């Protein structure tokens, strides 16, 4: 049928491997213990995301300072969305951070846990409600990498707008290809892009927690270096007002 590669079929092969937390269950659970593990896992998956971003067709051709800016802005968007997807795919209202670390019903009632997890659980339920397919998911995660740019703009701003539009169309092609009522396609396209818009609020919540945790001196929790500099670099920006959130629907 097709011996030349589609864009979605490439996004499939470059989709990062699912990583392990290295969380020891035998020892009793603890919030501090989970906090520390998720910081570390978060570091390794952002590294995974960099590798992934490079292999996204078009992304390499952007300027390096642009490639860096997009990962600096989008890392939590990607983690939030991939976490929502895996949770939706492995079951109940349970966040599946890794095979060896699931925030089960019991863990959900640990102190402070639900106050943060509710945001990620929202993403999970939305994917369930909408019955998002895998190809739709891959186009949507690709579009989240491209969900923020600096107010002043990128150095390769035009190439960025081309790339983004391509993956908007690629999301369009995903919906049409999905099994079901083709009469619903345009509505579904409205719905799915409305979900991508709603990720800004989710991420804004997650980042404020992450930063507050990072800047708490009485806290004393370990962050991985890669991730720690990204947080150190980004905190000034998110306070000032130098970021422009790309919306699908005003």
């Amino acid at each position: 049928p097709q011996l030349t590669p589609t864009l979605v079929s490439l996004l499939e092969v470059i989709e990062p491997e699912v990583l392990y937390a290295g969380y020891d269950s035998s020892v009793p659970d603890s919030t501090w213990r989970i906090m520390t593990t998720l910081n570390m896992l978060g570091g390794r998956q952002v590294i995974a995301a960099v590798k992934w971003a490079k292999a996204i067709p078009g992304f390499r051709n952007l300027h390096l300072d642009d490639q860096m800016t997009l990962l600096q802005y989008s890392w939590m968007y990607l983690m939030a969305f991939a976490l929502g997807w895996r949770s939706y795919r492995q079951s109940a209202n349970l966040l599946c951070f890794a095979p060896d670390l699931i925030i089960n019903e019991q863990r959900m009632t640990l102190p402070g846990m639900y106050d943060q997890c509710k945001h990620m659980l929202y993403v999970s339920s939305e994917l369930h409600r909408l019955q998002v397919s895998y190809e739709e998911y891959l186009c949507m995660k690709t579009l989240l990498l491209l969900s923020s740019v600096p107010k002043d703009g990128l150095k390769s701003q035009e190439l960025f707008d081309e790339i983004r539009m391509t993956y908007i169309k690629e999301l369009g092609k995903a919906i049409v290809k999905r099994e079901g009522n083709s009469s619903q396609n345009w509505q579904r396209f409205y719905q799915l892009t409305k979900l991508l818009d709603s990720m800004h609020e989710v991420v804004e919540n997650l980042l404020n927690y992450c930063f507050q945790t990072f800047l708490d001196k009485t806290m004393s929790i370990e962050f991985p270096e890669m991730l720690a500099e990204i947080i150190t670099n980004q905190i000034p920006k998110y306070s000032n007002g130098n970021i422009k959130k790309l919306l699908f629907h005003q």
Binding site: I47, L64, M68, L71, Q72, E229, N233
Partner: peptide
């Protein structure tokens, strides 16, 4: 900048 981020992107 973040030297390691830059490195991973470039090589």
């Amino acid at each position: 900048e973040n030297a390691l981020l830059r490195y991973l992107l470039d090589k």
